[PDB]
Amino acid sequence: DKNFLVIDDNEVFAGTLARGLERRGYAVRQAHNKDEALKLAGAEKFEFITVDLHLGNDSGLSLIAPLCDLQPDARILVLTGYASIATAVQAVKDGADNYLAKPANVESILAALQTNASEVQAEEALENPVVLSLEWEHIQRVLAENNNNISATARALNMHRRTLQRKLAK
């Protein structure tokens, strides 16, 4: 069957995604907060579920384990405008099948939900390492002040760790 649960507090985004999925033949329900997500996930069987992390006042990450318990057969994808390695690690531990940064289109969201999608994506990443172009001197200073710690340096510079690393790469 093709029942899809979209969990995101942004109802406009959620509606656009729902309409795109419906045009592809999915039957879509939306939840805009943790109460609604648990109500829905306790009432109907879903084959696919998307989960926003910054769920208004609620933690989307905190929903993943309870969702897996309610929906053991569902494929579950974190779909987030706040992407980070740290949340991706914890989301997978909690039971998420995959994790995608916004913006993503409907085709890529469906792709990311399929069996083995993560393994393909990991290989593609290893084949395509990223490098990014006075700023250099400022980052070398903050990095040295943080005992050569990119995580601490990332937080101080208000940039992603991945961005720091790509900029530091030869």
- Amino acid identity for residue 100 in this structure: L
The residue among 86, 124, 89, 90 whose CA lies nearest residue 108 is: 124
Least distance in Å: CB of 43 to a second copy?
28
Query: Cβ closer to a second copy: 3 or 165?
Result: 165
The CA angle 101-104-38, to the nearest 5 degrees, is 70
Euclidean distance between CA atoms 32 and 11, whole angstroms: 7
Query: Cβ closer to a second copy: 45 or 132?
Result: 132
> Is the preceding peptide bond at 103 cis, omega within 30 degrees of 0?
yes
Specify the 3-state DSSP secondary structure of 107: helix
CA atoms within 13 A on the CB side of 144: 6
Q: Tell me if 33 contacts a second copy by CB under 8 A.
A: no
Euclidean distance between CA atoms 64 and 50, whole angstroms: 10
Euclidean distance between CA atoms 98 and 93, whole angstroms: 11
Work out which of 5, 17, 51, 52 binds Ca ion, going by CB under 5 A: 52
Using CB under 8 A, which residues numbered 62 to 81 contact a second copy?
Answer: 81
Using CB positions, name the residue nearest to Ca ion.
54
Q: Which residue ranges make up the annotated binding site for Ca(2+)?
A: 9, 52, 54
Work out which of 30, 50, 71, 98 binds a second copy, going by CB under 8 A: 98
Query: Cβ closer to a second copy: 22 or 144?
Result: 144
Binding site for Ca ion (CB under 5 A): 9, 52, 54
Binding site for a second copy (CB under 8 A): 53-54, 59, 61, 81-93, 98-105, 107-108, 118-119, 121-122, 124-126, 128-132, 143, 147-152, 154-155, 158-166, 168-169
